[PDB]
């Protein structure tokens, strides 16, 4: 019980950056999207 990455293959090994830079601008577009809410739930009340 000690797998060799033998006949093992990944259709994926260059897409790293491109794929990483999407796991980045997805989440660098959620908190701000979340933060656009509290800020706007702050204009009317004030």
């Amino acid at each position: 019980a000690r797998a060799e990455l033998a006949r093992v293959t990944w259709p994926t090994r260059e897409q790293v950056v491109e794929g990483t830079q999407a796991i980045l601008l997805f989440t660098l577009a959620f908190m701000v999207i979340l933060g656009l809410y509290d800020t706007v739930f702050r204009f009317l009340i004030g």
Binding site: T9, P11, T12, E18, G19, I23, L24, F26, L34, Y37
Partner: protein, 415 residues
């Protein structure tokens, strides 16, 4: 998935759906602000902001900071997922609930719907408890003037979280219905990222005051980039195997199995079992042992963390050892003429497979275990210690982003 996600936004149905999500998101971050009609909202939090109510540390997070302020999303979207294991426990001992669930998707609606009414009942019990012992028992400690620490306040709060957990529930049932994807998942992941946020801009004016620094705030976040650029290749990893066929449509191509096929399901349910033994002992501030079992498992303390490492690892493996994929697989390799080199059907198709998910989900969920350990070592090493960065709420910072740009692509590869 960076230039393509942009051109995926250039598709006015795929594009469209990511906004209705915002519509809820807004209203959801909105629900993320709403006090209790009787809790001195003003006297609820920093009891919960303590090594005594900060044991509540985990509930605040997933809900979305909502617990501390005790918002209508206080419990968040919890009391439907701790009914997702007892039901995943009521799924194999009840050998017909899948037969209901799998003979068309309209036999998992009942499942979903009984899970929902129970998911309203549970969230009427988890509040039925935080009142009976926590807010109430102390007196007018956490509470408004005039209001009674008895039944009428206890009743103005039951409906605060039953149209407050029913609301966050619904937010899933209407994004999933007519907007994009699964409102769920999404709804937990956002709850961490909004708690993984202002501490950052605390940090910069602190990297101004003295307060930590650029280089502790270099090593903590380059780690976050080692998290984006690894987990993915891993999610799109696989072992490819040769087969052949002999002398009526379909596929003849090669068949690979993922090192790890799902990074999410096994890590979520893992956060789950991590909960019950903490929140059962958490509301007893007087008995010294229950106050041990609540601070130990604290996954932001080296031991609970060690148990957090564990549970995230082996839940990967054994949920990477439940569902009916290999059986489904073995049959379509059967009615249509296929086979593996040198390999027989029957028992040496059992032990030739029993060797592999004993070879993959070893190096695999190890990753997920080490994935769970070190931000606390980071939080034993750097400049911040908050239950958010317990390393659980980035796993999905990664994860959600990924599977989205992993199923959107899978949505486009269908038209």
């Amino acid at each position: 998935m960076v230039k393509a996600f942009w051109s995926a936004l250039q598709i006015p149905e795929l594009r469209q759906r990511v906004l209705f999500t915002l519509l809820v998101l807004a209203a959801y971050r909105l629900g993320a602000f709403i006090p209790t009609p009787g809790v001195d909202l003003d006297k609820i939090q920093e009891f919960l902001r303590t090594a005594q109510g900060g044991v509540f540390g985990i509930i605040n997070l997933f809900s979305g900071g909502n617990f501390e302020r005790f918002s209508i999303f206080a419990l968040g979207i919890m009391p439907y997922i701790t009914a997702a294991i007892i039901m995943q426990i009521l799924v194999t001992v009840v050998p017909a609930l899948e037969k209901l669930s799998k003979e068309g998707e309209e036999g998992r609606r009942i499942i979903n719907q009984y899970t929902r009414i129970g998911g309203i009942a549970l969230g009427a019990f988890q509040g039925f408890f935080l009142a009976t012992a926590f807010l109430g028992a102390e007196g007018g400690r956490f509470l408004l003037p005039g209001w009674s620490p008895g039944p009428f306040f206890w009743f103005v709060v039951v409906v605060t979280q039953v149209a407050g957990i029913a609301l966050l529930l619904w937010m899933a049932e209407r994004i999933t219905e007519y907007g994009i994807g699964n409102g769920t998942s999404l709804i937990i992941f956002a709850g961490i990222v909004v708690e993984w946020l202002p501490q950052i801009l605390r940090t910069i004016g602190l990297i101004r005051t003295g307060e930590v620094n650029l280089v502790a705030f270099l090593f903590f976040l380059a780690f976050i980039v080692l998290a984006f650029a690894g987990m993915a290749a891993v999610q799109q990893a696989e072992r490819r195997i040769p087969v052949q066929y002999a002398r009526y449509g379909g596929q003849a191509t090669y068949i690979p199995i993922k090192l790890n096929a799902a990074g999410v399901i096994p890590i979520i349910f893992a956060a789950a079992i991590l909960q019950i033994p903490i929140f059962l002992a958490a509301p007893f501030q007087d008995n010294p042992v229950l106050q041990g079992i609540a601070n130990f498992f604290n996954p932001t303390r080296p031991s609970g963390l060690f148990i957090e490492v564990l549970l995230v690892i082996l839940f990967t493996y054994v949920y990477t050892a439940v569902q009916f994929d290999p059986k489904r697989i073995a049959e379509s390799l059967r009615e249509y003429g296929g086979f593996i080199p040198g390999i027989r059907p029957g028992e040496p198709t059992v032990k030739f497979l029993e060797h592999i998910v004993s070879r993959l989900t070893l190096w695999g969920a190890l990753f997920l275990g080490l994935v769970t350990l070190l931000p606390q070592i980071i939080q034993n090493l750097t400049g911040i210690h908050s239950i958010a960065f317990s390393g659980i709420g980035l796993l999905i910072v990664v994860g959600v982003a990924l599977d989205t740009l992993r199923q959107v692509e899978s949505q486009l590869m269908l038209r």
